[PDB]
């Protein structure tokens, strides 16, 4: 499972970094290029793929 992801907003490969703040149960995914940021709740079973998942889902939901 890759940790760096293509940004849904600027389509820059591996430009998204994921930070797991487990102490606060929050994952923050940020694109280095276009500076888009997204915050989602996470669990101890969560992974950066799950945070990027929640980001893609939030984008598609907001774009309806």
């Amino acid at each position: 499972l890759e940790t760096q992801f293509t940004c849904p907003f600027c389509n820059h490969e591996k430009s998204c970094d994921v930070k797991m703040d487990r102490a606060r149960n929050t994952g923050v995914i940020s694109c280095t290029v276009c500076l888009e940021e997204f915050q989602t709740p996470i669990t101890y079973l969560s992974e950066p793929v799950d945070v990027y998942s929640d980001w893609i889902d939030a984008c598609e939901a907001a774009n309806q």
Partner: protein, 365 residues
Amino acid sequence: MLGFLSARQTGLEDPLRLRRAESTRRVLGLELNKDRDVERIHGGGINTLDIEPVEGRYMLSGGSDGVIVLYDLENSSRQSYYTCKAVCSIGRDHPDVHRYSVETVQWYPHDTGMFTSSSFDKTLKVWDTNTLQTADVFNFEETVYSHHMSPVSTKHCLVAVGTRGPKVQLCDLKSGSCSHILQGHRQEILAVSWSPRYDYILATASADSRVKLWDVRRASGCLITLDQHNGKKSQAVESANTAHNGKVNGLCFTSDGLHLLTVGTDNRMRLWNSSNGENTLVNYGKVCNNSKKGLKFTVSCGCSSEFVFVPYGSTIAVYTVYSGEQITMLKGHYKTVDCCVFQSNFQELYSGSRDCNILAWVPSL
């Protein structure tokens, strides 16, 4: 100021004096707008703004969510408080919406019936403003960081595009020829800007810490390479003659086009003689920027002294171009400011930032 009015009435001073002095005074009194608001439609940060060059009424805004919003800035209501309503919108439901962030949007000069928008989806789309449909699309092999149409060209209608490729593309809007490229950079071309003075002069700033001026008619590469030291540290041109000690992510010709303001990721802005690229050694102090993409900043027009409005963190730093003296910080944004566009008719400013807000700064009183 009653002295100014009296001098204008009595012919002591040219009306030019009152006009430019009052423009400068208005710019100095720039403050968060007391009675004005801008409609919020972008779901993501606004990366770019552009007020149309003719009549200065309509404003384009490209968001990080790929939508393009067209606002009317005129207060068509009778109240002193109004919101800049959104006339049109390339929203998520438009068949031609950009799939990724719109990074530059520009009105067609000489006419408001067309505009252009480049995105990180590797497309420069040319839109008919009336039908709001894509009149043309130019696809690129690599993401677009910036683009610019000449604000002066009555003859050519080239769009200079800077992508992550090391080549500056020149897309002819006259019969579509995107094959023309300029060689000489080595990394992503983060900013491009046509000279407002000279028709065929284009300045390009790239991540290789170099700024090059090209005569696009010419067959022999760039005209000038900007050098910080002008020759104090002189070396055979392979890696020397850098404009900055980092990525040069913003360009802006001054109003007359005789100087060039370059902002780079070394936390420095520099002013260059646009005719021979000599550094004028204007200080400006430290200009905080760490943007990994192009940084959009503008200069004032029609004032006694020229000003430059640079995004500075979550603020707008206003500097005097030719002295470097720091005027002020416009402080009303909650995240880093991506773009600021200057309305020259009324000395107004519109700033878009990552907080999904377009804030209007108006002169006080």
